Design a protein around this ligand. Structure first.
Ligand SMILES: *[C@@H]1O[C@H](CO)[C@@H](O[C@@H]2O[C@H](CO)[C@@H](O[C@@H]3O[C@H](CO)[C@@H](O)[C@H](O)[C@@H]3O)[C@H](O)[C@H]2NC(C)=O)[C@H](O)[C@H]1NC(C)=O
Ligand SMILES: *[C@@H]1O[C@H](CO)[C@@H](O[C@@H]2O[C@H](CO)[C@@H](O[C@@H]3O[C@H](CO)[C@@H](O)[C@H](O)[C@@H]3O)[C@H](O)[C@H]2NC(C)=O)[C@H](O)[C@H]1NC(C)=O
Ligand SMILES: *[C@@H]1O[C@H](CO)[C@@H](O[C@@H]2O[C@H](CO)[C@@H](O[C@@H]3O[C@H](CO)[C@@H](O)[C@H](O)[C@@H]3O)[C@H](O)[C@H]2NC(C)=O)[C@H](O)[C@H]1NC(C)=O
Ligand SMILES: *[C@@H]1O[C@H](CO)[C@@H](O[C@@H]2O[C@H](CO)[C@@H](O[C@@H]3O[C@H](CO)[C@@H](O)[C@H](O)[C@@H]3O)[C@H](O)[C@H]2NC(C)=O)[C@H](O)[C@H]1NC(C)=O
Ligand SMILES: *[C@@H]1O[C@H](CO)[C@@H](O[C@@H]2O[C@H](CO)[C@@H](O)[C@H](O)[C@H]2NC(C)=O)[C@H](O)[C@H]1NC(C)=O
Ligand SMILES: *[C@@H]1O[C@H](CO)[C@@H](O[C@@H]2O[C@H](CO)[C@@H](O)[C@H](O)[C@H]2NC(C)=O)[C@H](O)[C@H]1NC(C)=O
Ligand code: M4D
Ligand code: M4D
Ligand code: NAG
Ligand code: NAG
Ligand code: NAG
Ligand code: NAG
Ligand code: NAG
Lengths: 749, 742
């Protein structure tokens, strides 16, 4: 039977999140092994709350109540199989007493716990991972964290322990030697002694970041060690961490890096040294000799304040980082990159990524990149290159964003060069001389206003994916970009600047001159007028994104010119016409859409009416997205007009009535979205059929249902069609009558 | 009493526009002089739609039924004072028969009327103006316009006649010589004979634009005359048009201008010559010696296709344009503008606007603007300088009629607009040799620099500075301080660097201006600042801070911005819209300046509001909390303020109005409670009140509402806009109805 109020499934997982629930549901399936109740309004947990759910291994209770959680002594003690328990963001004032001995993972991130004690933790001898971070931090009103001596030593299976963003003052003593990962970032620990990590011969991660932070231009309330001194690490603090892979020392105000810290640290993979004062060490770097297995090195944001050196000064000793794959030098800040300045990097056999974002670089000697063994990612974004509930996510890196530097879709094609966010307002004849064979290029947001004529990319003719978004291109020549015969993806989003001017020219004819162009983005260009050729044409093109233009104007009733604007795109399967302010589509215009389409989006327009008949012309059409329009009526004979349609999206429309058979007219329909509409009911007329329906999803939330015996039939139909998934029954709600107002439609008797 | 469904006044005008009306309503005030039914769903009009309203001078039925309008003969012919009748955009297939003799103003703009007959027109002998434009145009399905011979010679009081955007072929013969203004744009009239206008000796305006149009890059379906040829104007076509003030020959494919066309028209004020092929004529141009009283000349978009000349070629004969005030030369298209290129224009005494928009100029000798008599507006926007229906039938078709520079900037003095170029930084000499610019636009140049107190030294008297839509690097606390007279600064849309935590953002310079009055930091995405976390000014009167991240700046774990605005000691107007505020910390709200009269926190996400804090804002007059998620109102409003005249609360979630909220609301004139969740209004809640807005609420229309219905009827001094939209949610029988209809 239809579970409630949780969406249940096998993988047995109850998904009961974000549901305005005020108590723990007692109507949960008893085979459930994992239960997600995050983001609810639950305020009390007692021993009665999971009475029948003894089969539970995982409970999530983060963010309860959503806009503190009173949990009773021993409330979960009976859950003999409970292993993972998530209590984040719950204003707990202490570790709840009497937690079950069977727990392996516990997270108390983002509470008010300032006392960690034997009574709460020491019995939990099976803990693999303990998360206690972010309980006292910044200007939060909270106390220094008291850690009862030995609380952790009974935890002889503890693999992870995280205490970051608490005021600790010292590494706690008596840590179990089972530790693999220790996070102590922003714990206000000024000094590290030789005893602090003495027996942690299995550690692979240590995070001492944010202790003695560098506070200039801090995006948070930041207090430095006195005088802005550096963290102080004893020469022997890492003597026995021979398993260390990851070390984070970002924002510890280091001027000097002791080579001997790495003496017995032969597996170090990742060394994070952001937001220190290391410009000097970058020019000498004894320590670099100690790290020939290091793969990622991050020296970002060590700029000296107020200084703008002509050049970056990299020590010869970078040449010893022989396993280096990625070097991050954001925010060093310098004027000019010369070939000689990167000599020490040129022979590193596996250095694939070099990242120079946000250095305010004015000039680069591009030929230098050829001399490298094999750069795959040249990231120069954000420079000054001109022509030739709570703010921070406690589960993320705090000092840098973790997404890929270049979109993967682009980088897969080959070597990439990103010059986004510079002032390259114009591509000169030699701008791309001496580059490697670039497959992926990003020039987004250079305020580029030029006329691309067919020669500007000649020096790098094999670009397969080109990003020219957020420029101001002047499409005044029909040969534009044609020197890129291999081109497969082209993004021209956000170049409206000239497109919006009726009087200037707009030539899109070059689209035809490409044999392998598969994807094209013309979104948010405000396209309403083109010169000479009113048609887009390509034999290769599979996908055109045309959202945010003015098809309203292009297909107005007094203008025939653009009636076939898309017909010439013979191979097209995917078309996005969202955000074109369409009030009505002329039938000839619609019939002139490519018959090859499988996926058509006309969402978020203003359609009042949709000629359904016209689907006869679209035999391969699988998906149709009309969400967010003004639609009033559905055709009563839809199966007459398509037999390919698998997905139909109609949410946020003005449909108040279904025609008979609709749900069974189908017949390839598997997903039908009728949410946020005006349906007051579903009559048995719509439920009639002679055929087996194959519908697997039907979306109904957001409809103002009439909750009387007048709706029993649909309710019946729901019981007799468990196979049809219907999401968020708690949101499929009665508008009326009074007694029923607010309840799910599934819970009226 | 309360009019329904219209909104009546003597300021005697019944505003009945856009109220979803199915037919002309019987319930209009009998003393109404002007009635606006435009944008309703009316489909039929007859001899008894207006029966009681014999005192009506104006009717507006434009755009009905709003998504054809059947009008019977004589439907209107009882209305004996009826002077102005607007019937635009109604799908009328013929002029209606039986219109009153009394008519002076008739618009039938945008219908389906292709016969202009004596039957419809000739009896209307008092017509002053007749609009018939846009009935057959572009690829519309429509027929050539048949104009019955002499149809207009009955109309011997006719002042303006408009026939644009109709297929005419020839100027109609037999036109009343009462005409001052004749609009024949886009009427396919390829030939202008000596006879066509000979009679009309009182013409002040003639529009022959778009006949033999220049079709390259047309924003509409465009049919050139054959071989793209020029309109044919006969030597003596304008011989007797001695009163002409306005002449529009835009897009008539002229290559040559006959100087003697202007011989007998020495009072010509405004001459429009856009979208022609007049580059040759611009360089030589006899006709320029024949325009002694001309004020406005537009020669925009005469570019030669494919052409990119080094310099503009301006005939010496421009020096005869002695009364010239404005010269428009958009889209001529040339590379460089030199001093010697503009010598002919320099001695003109009243030339105050030069417009060089959209010319693709790469370089400019700025010193030349100085040697002019008195430029007030130097407009160079959009260049390449480095360091139902589409068109409105009531606007000009070839250009925009908005001012070039915002008048709030131009008022201060000589203005220079370099917007939408590529001046990505301001070098040390960018502004040498300029006039004393008072108003300066640099919007949208992708400017990435660190302004530092010296970049505007050469034009230190700027008072309104627009740097919107750049990417400024605010890394120096002396930024802009050279402009000590600055009164307006617009830094909207420079979020490029603000959005990056790791770069610095210095906003200290604000305090360093003694006369800064208005500052706009909107849509900068500001969530972090460097060293100085506070904005301060002793002068600043207004700060716009919408589109930033006060949700972050005032979040609970950070105290640093708790006083971000308090040092704006003089501030009366503050705008914190669009800052994603879920809540505002009490101390933060208390630290907003005490001198505030006007505060907007609209379009945020506020779930609650501490009304008690208003006790500390003794001058606050307007409080604007629209578009939030507020769930409740204080019952104790009179205790927290005695200043507030306007309170705006639409688009929230308030479901109960507190007792003593109307009966006590001591200073409060205007209360906008529309689009909330009110289901009824308790008699407990029932005043300096004059406006009260309630549309959009889901009212239960069952008895009591009645007490409130009473209330309305008893205080009519409380205006309640949009009675038609104050609509019942329940029960089923009332669903569509105004609460007032029960
Ligand atoms: C200092 O540097 C260390 C090592 O680079 C950073 O450690 C990484 O911290 C992140 C953020 O918590 C961890 O990400 C999370 O991992 C889990 C487990 O797979 C995943 O479920 C989450 O969605 C999230 O990705 C990351 O695993 C961890 N790295 C390793 C190797 O364990 C640390 O965050 C840095 N400290 C600060 C304050 O930035
Ligand atoms: C301009 O248009 C293109 C084409 O739509 C946009 O690129 C496409 O973006 C979609 C995301 O909407 C990508 O699909 C996603 O791929 C991931 C990766 O495996 C998958 O996990 C997601 O569920 C989703 O399917 C698609 O890969 C991507 N295509 C390409 C060629 O990059 C582009 O983002 C648009 N540009 C702008 C500026 O908005
Ligand atoms: C060709 O040039 C002529 C002369 O400049 C243009 O004349 C102007 O046309 C506009 C648009 O109809 C008139 O504006 C309207 O005037 C009324 C009256 O006050 C006002 O209520 C409207 O809202 C609108 O402003 C304007 O008065 C008229 N100029 C004169 C002196 O009568 C004409 O539009 C041009 N033709 C084309 C096709 O662009
Ligand atoms: C940045 O903020 C300033 C100040 O708010 C904005 O300029 C102001 O814009 C308003 C319109 O929102 C102007 O008010 C209008 O004035 C006219 C003219 O008398 C009146 O008819 C209108 O009803 C309204 O009151 C205001 O004068 C103008 N202020 C100044 C000093 O120019 C500005 O638009 C904002 N910038 C951007 C890019 O959004
Ligand atoms: C090209 O550069 C632009 C600017 O860096 C990239 O845009 C960013 O992309 C990520 C992922 O989509 C977004 O989260 C950021 O919002 C974008 N920044 C801006 C300013 O828009 C773009 O992704 C890069 N393109 C490729 C193909 O790698
Ligand atoms: C400075 O230049 C910009 C760009 O030309 C002007 O912005 C236009 O202003 C009008 C009237 O407010 C708007 O309707 C347009 O949409 C604006 N265009 C753009 C691209 O933003 C701006 O008004 C000019 N500033 C001054 C002070 O005159
Ligand atoms: C890496 C972040 C550096 C932020 C400070 C900062 C430094 C800048 C520099 C380097 C320091 C020069 C100071 N005169 C040059 C140009 C623009 C500069 N803009 C900035 N916002
Ligand atoms: C004023 C409208 C002119 C539109 C055509 C147009 C012409 C342009 C020119 C002049 C044409 C020269 C062709 N090499 C130069 C630079 C950019 C140009 N960009 C354009 N969009
Ligand atoms: C397009 O650009 C090429 C290269 O500049 C040029 O030779 C060709 O003339 C251009 N096309 C047009 C129509 O100007
Ligand atoms: C049609 O699309 C397929 C798949 O992308 C592609 O392989 C083929 O090149 C396309 N057809 C043409 C004529 O380019
Ligand atoms: C759909 O379009 C066809 C022809 O293009 C037309 O005959 C039919 O009337 C239209 N149907 C609807 C319901 O508008
Ligand atoms: C601001 O710029 C000025 C002049 O360009 C320079 O003298 C001054 O040092 C700058 N201030 C800072 C803190 O860099
Ligand atoms: C405060 O505002 C008023 C209005 O502009 C102004 O007259 C006064 O000078 C300002 N105060 C100061 C100290 O500038």
């Amino acid at each position: 039977s239809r579970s409630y109020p949780c969406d249940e499934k096998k993988q047995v997982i109850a998904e009961c999140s974000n549901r305005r629930l005020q108590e723990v549901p007692q109507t949960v399936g008893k085979y459930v092994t994992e239960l997600d109740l995050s983001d609810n309004f639950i305020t009390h947990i007692t021993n009665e709350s999971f009475q029948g759910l003894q089969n539970l291994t995982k409970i999530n209770l983060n963010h309860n109540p959503n806009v503190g959680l009173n949990i009773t002594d021993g409330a979960f003690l009976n859950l003999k199989n409970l292993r993972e328990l998530l209590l984040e963001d719950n204003q707990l004032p202490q570790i709840p007493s009497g937690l079950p001995e069977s727990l392996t993972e516990l997270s108390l991130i983002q509470n008010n716990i300032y006392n960690i004690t034997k009574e709460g933790i020491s019995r939990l001898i099976n803990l693999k991972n303990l998360y206690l971070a972010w309980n006292c931090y910044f200007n939060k009103v909270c106390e220094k964290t008291n850690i009862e001596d030995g609380v952790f030593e009974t935890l002889t299976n503890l693999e992870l322990l995280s205490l970051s963003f608490n005021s600790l003052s010292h590494v706690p003593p008596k840590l179990p030697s089972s530790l693999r990962k220790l996070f102590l970032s922003n714990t206000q620990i000024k000094y590290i002694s030789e005893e602090d990590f003495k027996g942690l011969i299995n550690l692979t991660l240590l995070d001492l970041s944010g202790n003695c932070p560098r506070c200039f231009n801090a995006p948070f309330p930041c207090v430095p060690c006195d005088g802005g001194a550096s963290i102080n690490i004893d020469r022997f603090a890492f003597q026995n961490l021979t398993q260390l892979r990851y070390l984070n020392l970002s924002s510890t105000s280091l001027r000097k890096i002791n080579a001997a810290w790495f003496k017995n640290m032969p597996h170090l993979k990742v060394l994070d040294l952001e937001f220190n004062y290391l410009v000097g060490e970058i020019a000498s770097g004894a320590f670099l000799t100690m790290l020939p297995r290091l793969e990622i090195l991050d020296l970002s944001f060590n700029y000296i304040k107020g200084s703008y050196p002509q050049h970056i000064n990299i020590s010869r000793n970078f040449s010893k980082l022989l396993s280096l794959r990625a070097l991050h030098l954001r925010g060093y800040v310098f004027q000019e990159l010369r070939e000689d300045d990167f000599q020490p990097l040129m022979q590193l056999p596996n250095l694939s990524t070099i990242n120079l974002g946000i250095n305010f670089i004015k000039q680069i000697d591009f030929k230098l990149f050829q001399n490298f063994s094999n750069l795959e990612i040249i990231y120069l974004s954000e420079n000054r290159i001109s022509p030739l509930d709570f703010e921070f996510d406690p589960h993320s890196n705090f000092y840098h964003f973790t997404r890929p530097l270049i979109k993967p879709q682009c980088a897969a094609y080959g070597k990439a060069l990103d010059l986004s966010l510079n002032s390259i307002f114009f591509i000169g004849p030699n701008q791309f001389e001496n580059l490697p064979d670039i497959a992926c290029l990003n020039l987004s947001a250079n305020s580029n206003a030029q006329v691309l004529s067919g020669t500007e990319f000649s020096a790098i003719p094999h670009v397969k994916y080109l990003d020219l978004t957020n420029n101001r291109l002047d499409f005044d020549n029909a040969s534009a970009l044609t020197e890129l015969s291999d081109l497969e993806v082209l993004d021209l989003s956000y170049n409206s600047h000239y497109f919006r001017i009726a009087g200037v020219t707009h030539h899109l004819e070059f689209i035809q001159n490409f044999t392998n162009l598969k994807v094209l983005n013309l979104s948010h260009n405000n396209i309403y007028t083109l010169t000479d050729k009113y048609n887009l044409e390509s034999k290769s093109l599979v996908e055109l994104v045309f959202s945010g233009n003015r098809l309203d104007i292009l297909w107005n009733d007094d203008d025939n010119r653009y009636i076939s604007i898309f017909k010439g795109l013979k191979n097209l399967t995917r078309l996005d016409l969202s955000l074109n302010r369409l009030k009505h589509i002329p039938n000839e215009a619609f019939l002139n859409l490519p018959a090859s389409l499988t996926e058509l989006h006309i969402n978020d327009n203003m359609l009042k009416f949709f000629n359904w008949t016209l689907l006869q012309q679209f035999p391969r059409l699988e998906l149709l997205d009309l969400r967010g329009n003004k639609l009033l009526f559905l055709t009563d004979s839809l199966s007459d007009f398509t037999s390919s349609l698998r997905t139909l999206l109609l949410s946020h429309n003005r449909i108040s009535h279904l025609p008979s058979g609709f749900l069974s007219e189908v017949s390839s329909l598997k997903h039908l979205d009728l949410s946020s509409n005006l349906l007051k009911t579903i009559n048995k007329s719509a439920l009639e059929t002679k055929t087996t329906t194959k519908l697997s999803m039907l979306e109904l939330h957001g409809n103002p249902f009439e909750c009387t015996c007048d709706i029993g039939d649909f309710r019946r139909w729901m019981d007799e069609h468990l196979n049809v998934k219907i999401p968020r029954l708690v949101d499929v709600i009665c508008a009326s009558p009074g007694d029923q107002r607010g309840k799910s439609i599934v819970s009226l008797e």
